[PDB]
Amino acid sequence: SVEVYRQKIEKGGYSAAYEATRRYEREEIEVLSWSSRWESAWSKFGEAVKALGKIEGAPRALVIAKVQEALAYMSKPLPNMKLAMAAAVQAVRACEQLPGMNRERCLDAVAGALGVAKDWIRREMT
């Protein structure tokens, strides 16, 4: 829709993004405490999704999203590995359909990114 487009255009974002950029270089803006809390939690998700570089081919969004989903359960204060293996076998089955990928090689990329044994995902596959 264009009506939702025009209401954010009149708010003047291009000028306002340039002011806050200039204020940061003149040391008037410090790092907000929301951002320092953000990079501590997110840093484990960013390096774990870069470990799926060797998966080739098609739209790999489903393989990427389920590895990000399964890692979130293991990082809970009370980790649920039963639900963590649930999203993982969705990533193994979605990786298996791509041209050039084997069921054994998708078990290499998924279990390497999560950092668990290969047989832990092979148990729930059936």
Binding site: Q7, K8, G13, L32, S35, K82, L83, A86, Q90
Partner: protein, 119 residues
């Protein structure tokens, strides 16, 4: 001076509080907000069956089974079916029949409401 992802997140916040884009981001939509109403309807529909299912069988009401049955309703709509099979092994035995009651025995009411929410 610097450009890393922490300062990119910070300067992204600083322009929102400057140009007031968070409040005009909600008050310019007026169409996506109806999805909150349909969401608050299905959660009431799942919950009243969840307490009714516990009273016919004499089992105590297990909290969080209203949340599990709503996740399985959304994954059934997308087609992630081996995601379903592992969660059905995770819940207790007497509550497995409730989860397929949400997916299939309330197909006509509950899945139709999810079909109108994403639409």
């Amino acid at each position: 001076i610097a450009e890393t992802l922490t300062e990119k997140h910070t300067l992204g916040i600083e322009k929102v509080v400057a140009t007031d884009s968070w409040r005009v981001g909600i008050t310019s939509r007026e169409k996506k907000l109806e999805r909150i109403n349909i969401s608050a309807e299905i959660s009431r529909r799942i919950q009243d069956e969840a307490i009714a299912y516990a009273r016919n069988k004499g089992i105590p009401y297990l909290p969080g089974i209203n949340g599990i049955a709503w996740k399985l309703l959304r994954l059934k709509w997308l087609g992630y079916t081996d995601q379903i099979n592992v969660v059905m092994r995770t819940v207790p035995a007497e509550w497995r029949d409730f989860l397929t009651q949400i997916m299939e025995n309330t197909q006509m009411e509950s899945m139709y409401s999810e079909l109108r929410k994403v639409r």
